[PDB]
Amino acid sequence: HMEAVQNRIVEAAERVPGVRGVIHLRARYVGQDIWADMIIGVDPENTVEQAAEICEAVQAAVCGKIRRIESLHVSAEARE
Amino acid sequence: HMEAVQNRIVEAAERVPGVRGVIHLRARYVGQDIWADMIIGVDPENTVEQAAEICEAVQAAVCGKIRRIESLHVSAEARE
């Protein structure tokens, strides 16, 4: 069920270089698939280009570890 | 009606230093009030802190020029 899977999403995101916590994570089942929407924190002094790069990195790492996720949006917000 | 008001939103955003076009703008009436959701473009080499600053700037400039707007979210995406 969901919570197990949410823990796995947060844990996978957090192991990616540049991720400063997961700020928000919304996940829902579309049948047997997961669709999710997430915000990560990032260094405020990172450039927008760097923030985008970490987001794709997170998107790839999470999709790679949790196979049932068929849609994942990752966006970023300054933190710390 | 709406389109007039959307033109005014885009025009106000675009006069703010650091705004590289309006990428997306969703506006709806909640009665006589406007609630809107917008994405601006920004220099990819700006820092996340700078991108946030321009967003607040846009939020303030648009709310100040279009009085019926009672809710406005501004977020940012690298452009050019």
Swiss-Prot record, chains A, B:
Listed result of changing M38L: CTD behaves like wild-type
Organism (species): Magnetospirillum gryphiswaldense (strain DSM 6361 / JCM 21280 / NBRC 15271 / MSR-1)
Region of interest: C-terminal domain (CTD): 3-80
Residues at which Fe cation 3 binds: E77
Name the UniProt record assigns to this protein: Magnetosome protein MamM
Additional notes on this entry: This bacteria makes up to 60 cubo-octahedral magnetosomes of about 45 nm in diameter which contain membrane-bound crystals of magnetite (Fe(3)O(4)). Expression of just the minimal mamAB gene cluster (MGMSRv2__2365 to MGMSRv2__2381), including this gene, is sufficient to form a minimal magnetosome chain with small magnetite particles.
Annotated phenotype, changing V48P: CTD dimerizes, binds fewer cations. Loss of magnetic response, still stabilizes MamB
Chain sites annotated for binding Fe cation 1: D37, H73
Annotated binding of Fe cation 2, by residue: A52
Localization in the cell: Magnetosome membrane; Cell inner membrane
Outcome, altering M38P: Severely impaired magnetic response, cells make very few, small magnetite particles, less MamB and MamM protein accumulate. CTD no longer dimerizes, CTD has cannot fold properly and is unstable
Family: Belongs to the cation diffusion facilitator (CDF) transporter (TC 2.A.4) family.
Biological role stated in the UniProt entry: Essential for magnetosome formation; required for stable accumulation of MamB. May nucleate iron crystal formation. Probably binds and transports iron. Binds divalent cations, possibly up to 3 Zn(2+) per dimer in vitro, probably iron in vivo. One of 7 genes (mamLQBIEMO) able to induce magnetosome membrane biogenesis; coexpression of mamLQRBIEMO in a deletion of the 17 gene mamAB operon restores magnetosome vesicle formation but not magnetite biosynthesis.
Quaternary assembly: Forms homodimers via its C-terminal domain (CTD) in the presence of metal cations. Interacts with MamB via their CTD. Isolated CTD forms homodimers.
Domain notes: The C-terminal domain (CTD) is probably responsible for hetero- and homodimerization; it assumes a V-shaped, dimeric metallo-chaperone-like fold that can open and close. Val-48 forms the hinge between the dimers. Binds up to 3 divalent metal cations (probably iron in vivo); upon binding there is a conformational shift to a tighter dimer. If the CTD cannot fold correctly the function of the whole protein is decreased, suggesting the CTD confers functionality on the transmembrane domain (TMD), perhaps activated by ligand binding to the CTD.
Induction: Part of the probable 17 gene mamAB operon.
Knockout consequences: Single gene disruption has no growth defects, no accumulation of magnetite, forms empty intracellular magnetosome vesicles, decreased levels of MamB, mislocation of MamC in 1-3 foci or rarely in a shortened chain. Magnetosome vesicles are fewer and smaller, aligned in a chain with the filament, only a few have very small crystals. Other, possibly precursor magnetosome vesicles are visible. MamI mislocalized to cell inner membrane or in 1 to a few patches.
Organism domain of life: Bacteria
